[PDB]
Amino acid sequence: TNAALDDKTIVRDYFNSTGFDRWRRIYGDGQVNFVQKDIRVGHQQTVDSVVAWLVADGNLPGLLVCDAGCGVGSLSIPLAQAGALVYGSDISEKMVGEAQQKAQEVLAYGNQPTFMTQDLAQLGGKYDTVICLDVLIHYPTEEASAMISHLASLADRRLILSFAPKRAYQHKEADIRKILGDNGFSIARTGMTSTRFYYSRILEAVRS
Numbered sequence: 001t002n003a004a005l006d007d008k009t010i011v012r013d014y015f016n017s018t019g020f021d022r023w024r025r026i027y028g029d030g031q032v033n034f035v036q037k038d039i040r041v042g043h044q045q046t047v048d049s050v051v052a053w054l055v056a057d058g059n060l061p062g063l064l065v066c067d068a069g070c071g072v073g074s075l076s077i078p079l080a081q082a083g084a085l086v087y088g089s090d091i092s093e094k095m096v097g098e099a100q101q102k103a104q105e106v107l108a109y110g111n112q113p114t115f116m117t118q119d120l121a122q123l124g125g126k127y128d129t130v131i132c133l134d135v136l137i138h139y140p141t142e143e144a145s146a147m148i149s150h151l152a153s154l155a156d157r158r159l160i161l162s163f164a165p166k167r168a169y170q171h172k173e174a175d176i177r178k179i180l181g182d183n184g185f186s187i188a189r190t191g192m193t194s195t196r197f198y199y200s201r202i203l204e205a206v207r208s
């Protein structure tokens with residue numbers, strides 16, 4: 001018997017249990033405390049900023065996009081609404097199930113994202129753009145490095161990441177940029193969401 005479950009299992013079990021209930025609420029509608037409300041608003045800003053980047057490029061309709069660690073589809077759904085071909089995945093079956101429910105309710109039989117329960121490190125195939133928002137916060141830098149390298153291998157052109165700049169882990173921007181550089185990516189656009197209880201640094205990386 002192990003002294004500890006691996007980080008992925010701990011995170012997965014959390015988002016399949018009480019984490020599902022708490023984050024479905026934060027990412028959804030209904031009463032929240034002022035801390036949770038701040039997180040809801042901040043996270044919405046991060047999502048909206050990324051959608052805005054992709055819309056601004058003019059090539060979003062028909063674009064193949066991987067949304068790794070998609071949660072309840074907060075990013076996947078608006079990208080699909082804008083015409084992207086979205087492939088969302090999450091390690092938590094509960095989060096994935098909710099994403100599909102929310103998608104079916106608002107998109108019906110139109111351009112829906114495709115949702116799969118899977119560890120992002122096990123994803124295959126190739127995409128124009130790979131996106132991983134507010135997921136790396138759950139892993140130490142060493143593991144985050146391996147995750148970024150795997151995501152990079154799926155990205156033909158672009159990788160977009162967000163992280164808390166230096167349970168929960170902060171990452172040094174210098175470290176994240178180094179890992180991206182090691183994988184053959186240069187930094188293009190960047191962003192930053194800063195509220196009272198929510199901090200998310202956003203990097204757009206493009207294959208050079």
Ligand SMILES: C[S@@+](CC[C@H](N)C(=O)[O-])C[C@H]1O[C@@H](n2cnc3c(N)ncnc32)[C@H](O)[C@@H]1O
Nearest residue numbers: 015069070071074090091092095119120133135
């Ligand atoms: C804070 S939520 C962010 C969700 C989504 N990216 C968003 O911004 O709306 C973190 C999500 O990452 C997922 N996650 C954590 N580790 C993962 C992994 N190794 N592979 C895929 N998803 C993972 C969790 O299940 C959780 O749904």
